[PDB]
Each structure stands twice: as structure tokens, then as C-alpha cells.
């Protein structure tokens, strides 16, 4: 079950109300909040895309950082064992949250060395007051499908929804688009990121394309493990791509007003990708294989074989 102050949570219940009820919350939420947003360079870096998930722990010698970004209704989870430090950053969108919170407590409940120190900590930020209710409801699933867990986890970072929106000229957005957690540390901080790299594009066209959750990291070999992917041609692609902005943002975003300014340009890039390749799985793949990628001497991504 989720546990707040060593007692279980009474749900459904808002967030907003959650927080006010429990200081140690409404405090983690005002820090975070209040932070500068830093912008986090690619050095140890992995960058996890909407709809993806990574985990590991601070014996890996090649990631210290995990972090998303661009999120508008999109709830960032973060799970740790305090124990052994194993960690797992996911950017969810409320595809099929009931199937994702399993990857997530699967990924680290397979790490060893648990029982003696530490416990599980859960941190939920993102999403804002959208007139869809898209955020509202995302937020319940995630308190819902964590709370039918048996194991006892911790909800220490609650920032979502009506807790991360700001208003101007009576459009409402987040606050916070997006953070990074250090596996070392710990730390959970406002973030920014400027690479999201390897394969953005592909890995992008296969969320446009309807991909569901996927776990995109490989911790004992050190090692982001891209595809095979596989989509049927995304519909009326050519049609979309001679959209202007406003048509894109108001149909391919379901938060058209809250969106990042670069979103417009980096969905005709994904577009452009599928008018390209309408069947990767035999083109951009070959015998089945993953494309891998591994941090070079100098923190940056590299393919291999």
C-alpha cells in the first residue's frame, strides 16, 4: 500500500488535499516548486522520452543522471530503494497506467541486497489544472495502482496537478515540466535537457505511433537497447506535416495551450520521421537486433556492433 507519515493513505483523495494534510509532503512540494530550474548537460545523462522507462543503481559506471522533460499532463514517477539505491524514472502520459506502475515496482523489486537498509520511495511531479481533467485523472490512477501494491511504499514528492499549475492571462499551465533524480545522491531537482538523444526521432515516432511503455535501459551491461520497433504507416502523415502550427498543436497535443515552444518543430520532425519510414521493423533493424548504445570515455553515447 502507499504509506505517508508511516500510515496508510485514504483514497480517492486530491492531491491538493494530501498535501495540506501532511507537512513533510506540503514541504517537498514548496522546495521543489521554489528551485531554479538547471540545465542539466549530457555528461552521465539518460534521458527518458514520454512513454518510457529506465532504471539502475549507483554500481553503474556509465549513468549518473536519469531525466524527462516536456511534461504538460504527463506525470514523472520516480522510484527508489533507499537500501540499495536502485532507481527507476519513468514519463507517464496515462497510456495504460494500471500495466505501467507493475514495470515500474518490477524494475525494482529484481534488485538484491534490499532487506537490511532503506525502504521504497515513490515521487509523483507534473501534470497541471487542464480544463480536460486529464491530469486529475492521471494522478488517481497513479495513487490508485501504487496503493494496490502489496509491498509498503513511501510517498514522499507529491507535485502534480492542481500543486504544479500557474496561471497567466487565465490559461493555466505546470509549473514544472520536467526533473532529474541523481542515483548517487538521490537528489530530485528541477531540470532541463538539451539532449535527448540517441535515436530521438525514432524513439519518438514510435510513441506517435501508439508504442505503450517500454523499458529502455539495460543496467548489468550498461547499455540503452533501441527496438525493433514495429507500426503500421501513421495515418494521413503527409496531410498533418502541411498543417500549420495551430492545427498541430490544437490536434496532435491534448494540452494545446500548455505546450513547450519548441513542440510544434519537434512533431513535424517525428512526422517527418514516419512519412520516412513507414515499416522500420525490417529497414531499420536487422535479424531482430537492437540498436546499442553505450557511454563513451567521455559521457557521451555511442553505438556498438
Known amino acids: 500500500p502507499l504509506l505517508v507519515e508511516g500510515r496508510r493513505v485514504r483514497l480517492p483523495q486530491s492531491a491538493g488535499d494530501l498535501v495540506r494534510a501532511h507537512p513533510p509532503l506540503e514541504e517537498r512540494a514548496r522546495l521543489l516548486r521554489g528551485q531554479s530550474v538547471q540545465q542539466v548537460g549530457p555528461q552521465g545523462l539518460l534521458y527518458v522520452q514520454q512513454r518510457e522507462l529506465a532504471v539502475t543503481s549507483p554500481k553503474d559506471g556509465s549513468i549518473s543522471i536519469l531525466g524527462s522533460d516536456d511534461a504538460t499532463t504527463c506525470h514523472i514517477v520516480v522510484l527508489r530503494h533507499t537500501g540499495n539505491g536502485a532507481t527507476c524514472l519513468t514519463h507517464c502520459d496515462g497510456t495504460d497506467t494500471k500495466a505501467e506502475v507493475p514495470l515500474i515496482m518490477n524494475s525494482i523489486k529484481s534488485f538484491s541486497d534490499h532487506a537490511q537498509c532503506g525502504r521504497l520511495e515513490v515521487h509523483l511531479v507534473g501534470g497541471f489544472s487542464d480544463d480536460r481533467q486529464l491530469s486529475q485523472k492521471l494522478t488517481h490512477q497513479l495513487l490508485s495502482e501504487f496503493d494496490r501494491q502489496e509491498d509498503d511504499i513511501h510517498l514522499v514528492t507529491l507535485c502534480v496537478t492542481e500543486l504544479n499549475d500557474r496561471e497567466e492571462n487565465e490559461n493555466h499551465f505546470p509549473v514544472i515540466y520536467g526533473i532529474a533524480v ?82 510544434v518543430e519537434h512533431i513535424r520532425s517525428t512526422l517527418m520521421f514516419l512519412k520516412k519510414h513507414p515499416s522500420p521493423a525490417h529497414t531499420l533493424f536487422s535479424g531482430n537486433k537492437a540498436l546499442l548504445y553505450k557511454k563513451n570515455e567521455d559521457g557521451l553515447w555511442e553505438k556498438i556492433s
Open 182 to 263: 541523481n542515483i548517487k545522491t538521490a537528489e530530485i531537482y528541477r531540470a532541463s535537457f538539451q539532449d535527448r538523444g540517441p535515436e530521438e526521432q525514432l524513439r519518438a515516432a514510435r510513441t506517435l505511433a501508439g508504442g505503450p511503455m517500454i523499458s529502455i535501459y539495460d543496467a548489468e551491461t550498461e547499455q540503452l537497447r533501441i527496438g525493433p520497433y514495429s507500426w503500421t504507416p501513421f495515418p494521413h502523415v503527409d496531410f498533418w506535416l502541411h498543417q500549420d502550427d495551430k492545427q498541430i498543436l490544437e490536434n496532435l497535443s491534448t494540452s494545446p495551450l500548455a505546450e513547450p515552444p519548441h513542440f
